[PDB]
Amino acid sequence: KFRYMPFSPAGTPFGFTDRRYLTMNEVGYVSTVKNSEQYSITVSFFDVGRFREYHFEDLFGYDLCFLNEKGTLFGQSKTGQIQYRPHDSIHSNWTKIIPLQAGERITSVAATPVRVIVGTSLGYFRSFNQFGVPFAVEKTSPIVALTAQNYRVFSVHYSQFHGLSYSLSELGTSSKRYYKRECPLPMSLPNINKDANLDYYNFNPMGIKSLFFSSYGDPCIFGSDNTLLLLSKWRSPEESKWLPILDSNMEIWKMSGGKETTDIHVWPLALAYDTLNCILVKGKHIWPEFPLPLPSEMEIRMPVFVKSKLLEENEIQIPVSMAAEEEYLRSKVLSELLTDTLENDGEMYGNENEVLAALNGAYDKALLRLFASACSDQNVEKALSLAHELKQDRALTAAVKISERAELPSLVKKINNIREARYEQ
Amino acid sequence: FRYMPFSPAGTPFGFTDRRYLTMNEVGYVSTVKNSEQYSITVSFFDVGRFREYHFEDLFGYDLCFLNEKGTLFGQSKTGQIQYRPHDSIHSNWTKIIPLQAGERITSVAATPVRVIVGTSLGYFRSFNQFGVPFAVEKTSPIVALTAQNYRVFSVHYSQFHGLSYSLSELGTSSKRYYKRECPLPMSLPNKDANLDYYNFNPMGIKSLFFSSYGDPCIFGSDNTLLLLSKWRSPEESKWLPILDSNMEIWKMSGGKETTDIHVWPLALAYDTLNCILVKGKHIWPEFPLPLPSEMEIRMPVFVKSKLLEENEIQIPVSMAAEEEYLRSKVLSELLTDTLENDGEMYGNENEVLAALNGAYDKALLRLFASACSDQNVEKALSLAHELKQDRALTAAVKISERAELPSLVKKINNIREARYEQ
Amino acid sequence: KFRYMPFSPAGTPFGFTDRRYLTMNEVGYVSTVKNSEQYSITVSFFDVGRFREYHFEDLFGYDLCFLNEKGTLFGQSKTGQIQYRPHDSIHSNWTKIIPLQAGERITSVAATPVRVIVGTSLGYFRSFNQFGVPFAVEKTSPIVALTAQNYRVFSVHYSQFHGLSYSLSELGTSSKRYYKRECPLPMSLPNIKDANLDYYNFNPMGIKSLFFSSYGDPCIFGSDNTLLLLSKWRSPEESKWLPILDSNMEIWKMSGGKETTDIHVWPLALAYDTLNCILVKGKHIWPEFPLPLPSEMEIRMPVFVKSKLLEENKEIQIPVSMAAEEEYLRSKVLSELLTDTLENDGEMYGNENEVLAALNGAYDKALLRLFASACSDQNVEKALSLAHELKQDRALTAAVKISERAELPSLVKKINNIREARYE
Amino acid sequence: DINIDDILAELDKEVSPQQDFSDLMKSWKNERCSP
């Protein structure tokens, strides 16, 4: 019975308003409005300079739009048409009519500089390269959503018989390797038990706000839970795992200073290194309206906080040790992802070296603060562990100072032994 | 779920006293409901190899795996399993498995090397070619059991695990699982004959069977042939809908879907599916078994709407070129996989690969001429990259001249230089 | 619909009583009792020498308890409060409350000698250290059970959509290795008496219990009442769950063929070749506060046709052939796992080498009984195949002697060729 | 039913102080009851 409604990353429903948004890539937002029997397609750009906001009137009503720097992927699921429009006039707006069997509806269409992907409701995965040339076609689980960057291709699939799953993949030169094949995604699913939210569900039954790769290309998805999930160590599936790096719900409740504000809503756009690019919608319609607001860019925060204690202590007021814990964990996961990119994916921005160094410093300072807290607790064992997790000897001597001023001479000896082992190694 | 027993490519009675337990290249086990007894007519498409003996079955074995060395006969309810070797020297040994309350043999895969028995509960079971137990284990509810050359391949659906499949081959030390209960992408079914076959085969898999080389293949309720390409490489393993029998029958039908036509794939003869076309309400073959109508492989790249707009269905030259391109690509890949693992089991596979390279490059050059007609430099250039041999580059540059596109000429020349130089 | 409820290994509900076993295992059992609002938690250790019993009152009403030689992990799902109590008592009972979002309820708690694990209804996997220092928080398919033996942690990831799944991993002090990740767990959920449902209310999944083996192989006992062991768990390629016991059949066996009902094996822990579990012969499948003496039953390969036994009986008689086959399979699987552990993890007791040797002997002698059976059938080919599997060449001398006593000169010649081949 | 039990047996054929104590205890009983 389920309806495989076509959806595109960060796309918005029609609602009673004829204007909508097919997608809101950080490059640009594809605002489309149904006028008469056609649709006025405003291909807007958050960077108008390199890509001016060209408009074209579409009589085909292309529903699935996938914006990207090379171009945009305008296609209509019902017609099987994919009128990709390169932003460069050098390449024409190549179009193709995909074979659609009875009831086949294009669930999503991913567009990448390497190639273009098109998923069908029947599970018959399809994908063609640029300038409309066939690339490959196969059968997989019903494609739910399609987010791909370069060779990387993250595909989400769901069936009423297979369950929530995602076949993360990348274009191995020999063939399209699948880091994860129909792996069970741990993402939260929408619960019917709101009219605008349900309309969005009628538009996005999966309640998936958007699928967008990180600044480093890491799989990042955002949905009903109002939290951003990152598949850490995705390049190593054996050890890969999803992390709720950010939680828009609690983050908004925090920026409200304990003043729960239902009207506020967050719309994913992208992940700028550590800050999540996402519109902070402020209307009944959880999705942005034609006058698209500015992007709200918030740093990730480990959801290690309990609203009750934060309210009791109190834009929220947070205990110094509790904030230290969150900062420590975020620094750990961040630096981990930084080294992952720098080594497995390779250094790209160049500044990532300094980013990792600063993350190491923050990791160590948070460890030192928590170690001082533990010494205040006199838990010599807990403080000793905290000192052990230090990743630099400067923090080790700082912890020696903390213990000495904390009158922990035995623990100072333990730190001395720690450094002995470390620098002697 | 019904979890009715299923044999490789079998038919129900359809409110009748005659049916087939299974259909295979080896044969088709036509059975008559001989009162309480069952005149199981073991029909062989090559009776010369083995005599079609109409042994009476008192147990009414619902399940029946048919391998050239022996025709198995399993009974899900009673749990008794009659294995009747096709060789008189080998006697028809029988066994009774311990079935738990509700446990029912859903399918069976009897190989000459080994025997495998699966049940509704998912309690995987196995014996030797004579019935000596090999191993027993619990798995997902068994729904399909296809095995040849001890290549145990199986499907498993569950209300909780869902549709899945356990591809495996019995290594000497043990059975290495290529794809252990991985999620099968087969499209589950949602007229009267369709309801009958869903009562008999609610799973919707018209038949689970390996390919000519031995690659996993299957025909779902979607009426499309799926083959697990790259199965020998789990990371690269992918299911390929190598046939859409709907699309094929539609094309041969002159743009006219005809329900009465129904295909029944016993196996895949490399590039031409071994199948029986039955024209009747009942999708399964009836007692007057139609001749095996081996269907040529056709990648379902054709657009049905575009195909009928073009109009045996007239096919665009470019679209047919693309279909040949994809068919030869996927084939060549499968042949290479089988040859690096199984080798030239036929002795013709290397020549088939050479012919596939030739035809694949021919389709590439035809699409290259099409792209040159499109005057798209990067299109024809990408097509030039796909070329494998040097004569393809000569043809590409010659066509680029034919379309007065010197930029291409230069690009193909550079690629040709880099190719034959290194 | 399904309901996510806190679970602990082999736990028991309060039922009509005010006291229930929070959990039980080889190390011991912890049972709580309602006491004028305040709950009285009692921690009982099986090995008196190793540890000392202690009881404390729990105002938080912790429903989740994990027991391991090092300590205990008491937690309350509805509150998110988690308290660890080191058994040594050298270290204070560090305690903390995890962040529980609306509806986030702790599904179970896992204790590792170095790390700590907490599972939530939302699948928010959380990792703390022995002193409670957080490690990281991860979202995964909701985990219903969190067995953790030594450094080996076995989790049961189930979802309404992802279905039944399990992840096997040994975090260890370092070199954390994930043997398996949310792979489908081949177990059968209960069918949907009042006590059965209440336990299902107390255990929606119907998991009778969850634990590792004596040597440390993951062990599961679902509502089906079948003990499944992950053969070759150390190697994911050949990893496979093998039903080593079907409690219902064994009970019907020892009952003299009688279809007893009240009997309920309460899985406690799996000794090598033998299951330590309590037979609750009462309406309540779970036991009572006056915990009875644990019972021991040897593992059995489920290859007995109940119809065959019924026909034999009309004290249950088993054909020597079907018996011998069962002992063959049991010895085979036991030797497989024993060798795997011995080569992979050495031995905590030196006897295991001799145990494996005797098991190989029993394996060969079971092949020999079945070889004689085939010889009596004149299936010299089947008997030849049997002797082919024979591991010991001295047992092969026994087999050729049998063939001589079976008057199978062709057989005898075949086994002689086998003698020479093995000598080669 | 070829009786290999002898064959399996031979294939298996491949001063305990406790015993001394048992002998003592038997002897002591006999002494007690013996006239």
UniProtKB/Swiss-Prot annotation, chain A:
Compartments, record wording: Nucleus
Included stretch of the parent chain: 473 to 924 of 927
Transmembrane spans: none
Other comment: Present with 3280 molecules/cell in log phase SD medium.
Function: Accessory factor for DNA replication. It plays a role in accurately duplicating the genome in vivo.
UniProt protein name: DNA polymerase alpha-binding protein
Organism of provenance: Saccharomyces cerevisiae (strain ATCC 204508 / S288c) (Baker's yeast)
WD repeats: 223-263
Disulfide pairings: none
Curated annotation (Swiss-Prot), chain B:
WD repeat locations: 220-260
Subcellular location(s) per record: Nucleus
TM annotation in the entry: none
Additional record remark: Present with 3280 molecules/cell in log phase SD medium.
Purpose of the protein: Accessory factor for DNA replication. It plays a role in accurately duplicating the genome in vivo.
Protein name as annotated: DNA polymerase alpha-binding protein
Shown residues within the full chain: 474 to 924 of 927
UniProtKB/Swiss-Prot annotation, chain D:
Superkingdom of this protein's organism: Eukaryota
Annotated signal peptide: none
Coiled coil: none
Localization: Nucleus
Reported effect, W28R: In sld5-12; temperature-sensitive mutant. Defective in DNA replication
Function of the protein: Required for DNA replication. Functions as part of the GINS complex which plays an essential role in the initiation of DNA replication by binding to DNA replication origins and facilitating the assembly of the DNA replication machinery.
Assembly behavior: Component of the GINS complex which is a heterotetramer composed of SLD5, PSF1, PSF2 and PSF3. Interacts with PSF2.
Family: Belongs to the GINS4/SLD5 family.
Protein name: DNA replication complex GINS protein SLD5
Gene: SLD5
Full protein stretch here: 2 to 74 of 294
